[PDB]
C-alpha cells in the first residue's frame, strides 16, 4: 500500500531552521513528484514547492523561493523540506503529498502532517485553575464545572475527568494562543446539580513536553474542612367553631404544604371524607415564601352536619421530593357532648375603686371544647373582652371564663350586658345570659 510517513513535532525559535522528512513506501518513488503543502491553524492550504526525485528538479511558490531547500534520497525513498529563517507565521502543519510525474491526477496520497511551532517561548507547564459557579444554590437541575489550563507551551495538553470515568457532558475547547505566546484552554463538564457535594469532580491535565501531570480537584464531597454555609411537611387546619355552629357561615378544612423544593414544585392534592375520595376541594396556586421553598394551599368546604356527626377529613399530598406520600387527618373531637352552663358575675367590690371594671362570664360543664363566646351591650356587640382557653375539669368536662372590661360609669348607670355562647350541645347551638347593676 502507498504510504507517506512524516517526521515528528518541531518547536523552533524565530530565525532558526527546520528539516522535515517524508518516508515514502509501497510505490515506485521516482515515478511521482513530491510536493510540500502547509496549513496554518484554522487557515487554508498553501502549496510551497515540489521536487522530481528522478532528477532533483525543483518548482516553488515565490513566497518560499530562497527560504526552502527541497531534497530527496532514492535509496531510502525519503523526501526532505528544509525551511530556513523561521518566522512566527511559519507555524503550521506541513504535509508531503505525491503527484504522478507523467499525467497530473492531483495529490492522491498525503503524509500525516508535521506540526511546526515558531516561538520565543520556552517550554512551560500549565497552571490549572478550577472553574465553578459562584453560588450554585439555584432552582436549576444542571450545573457546569471545569478547569482552566493556562500559560503552557508548547501544545498539546490532554484533559480527562475522573481518570476517564466521566465522559458524558465534557467539552474540551481548542487552545488559544495568548499575546504572551503561551497557550491556554478550558475543559468543562455539565453534571446534575444534586451530585455536587455527593460525587467528586477532578480534571487530569497532562502536558507531555514539560513532563507535567496535574489532577486538580475542582469539587469535593461535603464535610470538614469545608465551611458549613428537610423535605415537605403538611398541616391540616379544622374549621372555625362559629362556622360549624351557624348555618349562615361556611366551614372549611384547610390543607397547607410547606418546605416544598424549588426543583420539585408539585401541586398534587387528594381529599377523603370518611375514607371515600372527594373532588370538590378548591386548590390555590403555589407561592415562594421568602425561603428557598414553595407553599401551596387546598381548601375543602364541609357541610355543618358532617363535621358535627364526626367525619374524618383526610388530606393526601404528593410531590417528587418525597419517598412515599404525606397524609394528615382531622375531625371534630370525639366523645359524648355535654351542655355548657353559663353564669354571669358582677365586678368585685374591691375593683369598684378603679376607673374600669371587669364583667365576668363563667362557662362550665361543656364537651367537646369547641366553643365561641361573645359579649353584647343593650342591643349591640361589644369589643373590649378577652376569653380564656377551655380548661379540663376533674369531671371530664371543660370550663372557661370570658372577661368584658367596661368604664365603671357604664356599669353604674345600669347598662345591661350579655354573655352569648355558641356550642353544639346547646339548643339551636346558642344561649345568652344577662348582667346588670343590682
Amino acid at each position: 500500500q502507498v504510504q507517506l510517513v512524516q517526521s515528528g513535532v518541531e518547536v523552533k525559535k524565530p530565525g532558526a531552521s527546520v528539516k522535515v522528512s517524508c518516508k515514502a513506501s509501497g510505490y515506485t518513488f521516482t515515478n511521482y513528484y513530491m510536493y510540500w503543502v502547509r496549513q496554518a491553524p484554522g487557515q487554508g492550504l498553501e502549496w510551497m514547492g515540489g521536487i522530481n526525485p528522478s532528477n532533483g528538479g525543483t518548482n516553488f511558490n515565490e513566497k518560499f523561493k530562497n527560504r526552502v531547500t527541497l531534497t530527496t534520497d532514492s535509496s531510502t525513498t525519503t523526501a526532505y523540506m528544509e525551511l530556513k529563517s523561521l518566522q512566527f507565521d511559519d507555524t503550521a502543519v506541513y504535509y508531503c503529498a505525491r503527484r504522478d510525474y507523467r499525467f497530473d491526477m492531483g495529490f492522491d496520497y498525503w503524509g500525516q502532517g508535521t506540526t511546526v511551532t515558531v516561538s520565543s517561548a520556552s517550554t512551560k507547564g500549565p497552571s490549572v485553575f478550577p472553574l465553578a459557579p459562584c453560588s450554585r444554590s439555584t432552582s436549576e437541575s444542571t450545573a457546569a464545572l471545569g478547569c482552566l489550563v493556562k500559560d503552557y507551551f508548547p501544545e498539546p495538553v490532554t484533559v480527562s475527568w475522573n481518570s476517564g470515568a466521566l465522559t458524558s457532558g465534557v467539552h474540551t475547547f481548542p487552545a488559544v494562543l495568548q499575546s504572551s505566546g503561551l497557550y491556554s484552554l478550558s475543559s468543562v463538564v455539565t453534571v446534575p446539580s444534586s451530585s455536587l457535594g455527593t460525587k467528586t469532580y477532578t480534571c487530569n491535565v497532562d502536558h507531555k513536553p514539560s513532563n507535567t501531570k496535574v489532577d486538580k480537584r475542582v469539587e469535593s464531597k461535603y464535610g470538614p474542612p469545608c465551611p458549613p454555609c428537610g423535605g415537605p411537611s403538611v398541616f391540616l387546619f379544622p374549621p372555625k367553631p362559629k362556622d360549624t355552629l351557624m348555618i349562615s357561615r361556611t366551614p372549611e378544612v384547610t390543607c397547607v404544604v410547606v418546605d416544598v423544593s424549588q426543583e420539585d414544585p408539585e401541586v398534587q392534592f387528594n381529599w377523603y371524607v370518611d375514607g371515600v375520595e372527594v373532588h370538590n376541594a378548591k386548590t390555590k396556586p403555589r407561592e415562594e415564601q421568602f425561603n428557598s421553598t414553595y407553599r401551596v394551599v387546598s381548601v375543602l368546604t364541609v357541610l355543618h352536619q358532617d363535621w358535627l356527626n364526626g367525619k374524618e377529613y383526610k388530606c393526601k399530598v404528593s410531590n417528587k421530593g418525597l419517598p412515599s406520600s404525606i397524609e394528615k387527618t382531622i375531625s371534630k373531637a370525639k366523645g359524648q357532648p355535654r351542655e355548657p352552663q353559663v353564669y354571669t358575675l358582677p365586678p368585685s367590690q374591691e375593683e369598684m375603686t378603679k376607673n374600669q371594671v371587669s364583667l365576668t362570664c363563667l362557662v362550665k360543664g361543656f364537651y367537646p371544647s369547641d366553643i365561641a363566646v361573645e359579649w353584647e351591650s343593650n342591643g349591640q356587640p361589644e369589643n373590649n373582652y378577652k376569653t380564656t382557653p377551655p380548661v379540663l375539669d376533674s369531671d371530664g368536662s371543660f370550663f372557661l371564663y370570658s372577661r368584658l372590661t367596661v368604664d365603671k360609669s357604664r356599669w353604674q348607670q345600669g347598662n345591661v350586658f350579655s354573655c352569648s355562647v355558641m356550642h353544639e350541645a346547646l339548643h339551636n347551638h346558642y344561649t345568652q345570659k344577662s348582667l346588670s347593676l343590682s
Partner: protein
C-alpha cells in the same frame, strides 16, 4: 498567478440532502482536452483527501456519491446524498500553471433544530488571584447554529480587546456547538471593579441572556 474562489463558505444540510460546492478560477484552467482542477476532503486533524481529479474522474477508493463537473473557470463538486462521514471541509486546487493554489474551502455542516445556549459564568479562582492575573470565563453550551455574540460588561461598561473566544467542533451525537469566552484582567484592574457579566445573543434566545456575579460576593 491564478486564484480560486469557493462558494458558499459554509453549507448547512441534513444527512440525505445534496451538496453542490462551487469553485471559480480567475483564468481558464482547461488546456489540451483536460481541466486542471481537483477536489479534496479534509476532516479535523487529518490530511486532505483527494476525491476527484481533472474536475470529473473519480479517485480510486472514493464513494460513488461524490462527482465533479465543469470546464473553463466554473467547477462544481456534487455529493448526491450526504452521509455523516461527509460533513467536513472541501477544497478545490488548480494546476494549469505554477504556482499551484487552493480555494478557501467550503465547510459542510449538519442542519439541526435551533437550540438556545445554556449559559454559565465562572469567576477567577482564589489560586489564580494570588498570581496577579484574573480570568473570568463565560460558557455557551449545546447551541445551534455556530453564530452567537458574547459581550463582556464590567459595572455595565462594555469591554473590548481584552477577551478571547474558542469554539468546539459540531458534536457527533446531538450536532450541537459549545463556546467559551475568557475575559483576562490584571489583579489591580479586577480589584478596581465589582460586577462582572457576559451578555449572550443567539437565534434561539428571544431576549439576551446575561449571567453575572459580584467579586466580593462569592
Amino acid at each position: 498567478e491564478i486564484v480560486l474562489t469557493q462558494s458558499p463558505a459554509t453549507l448547512s444540510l441534513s444527512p440525505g440532502e445534496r451538496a453542490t460546492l462551487s469553485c471559480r478560477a480567475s483564468k481558464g484552467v482547461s488546456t489540451s482536452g483536460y481541466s486542471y482542477l481537483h477536489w479534496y476532503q479534509q476532516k479535523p486533524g487529518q490530511a486532505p483527501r483527494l476525491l476527484i481529479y481533472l474536475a470529473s474522474y473519480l479517485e480510486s477508493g472514493v464513494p460513488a456519491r461524490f462527482s465533479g463537473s465543469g470546464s473553463g473557470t466554473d467547477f462544481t463538486l456534487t455529493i448526491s446524498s450526504l452521509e455523516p462521514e461527509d460533513f467536513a471541509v472541501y477544497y478545490c486546487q488548480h494546476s494549469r500553471d505554477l504556482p499551484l493554489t487552493f480555494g478557501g474551502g467550503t465547510k459542510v455542516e449538519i442542519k439541526r433544530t435551533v437550540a438556545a445556549p445554556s449559559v454559565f459564568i465562572f469567576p477567577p479562582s482564589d489560586e489564580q488571584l494570588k498570581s496577579g492575573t484574573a480570568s473570568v470565563v463565560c460558557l455557551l453550551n449545546n447551541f445551534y447554529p455556530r453564530e452567537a455574540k458574547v459581550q463582556w460588561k464590567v459595572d455595565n461598561a462594555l469591554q473590548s480587546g481584552n477577551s478571547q473566544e474558542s469554539v468546539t467542533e459540531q458534536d457527533s451525537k446531538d450536532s450541537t456547538y459549545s463556546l467559551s469566552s475568557t475575559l483576562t484582567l490584571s489583579k489591580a484592574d479586577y480589584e478596581k471593579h465589582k460586577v462582572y457579566a457576559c451578555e449572550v445573543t443567539h437565534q434561539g434566545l428571544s431576549s439576551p441572556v446575561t449571567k453575572s456575579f459580584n467579586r466580593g460576593e462569592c
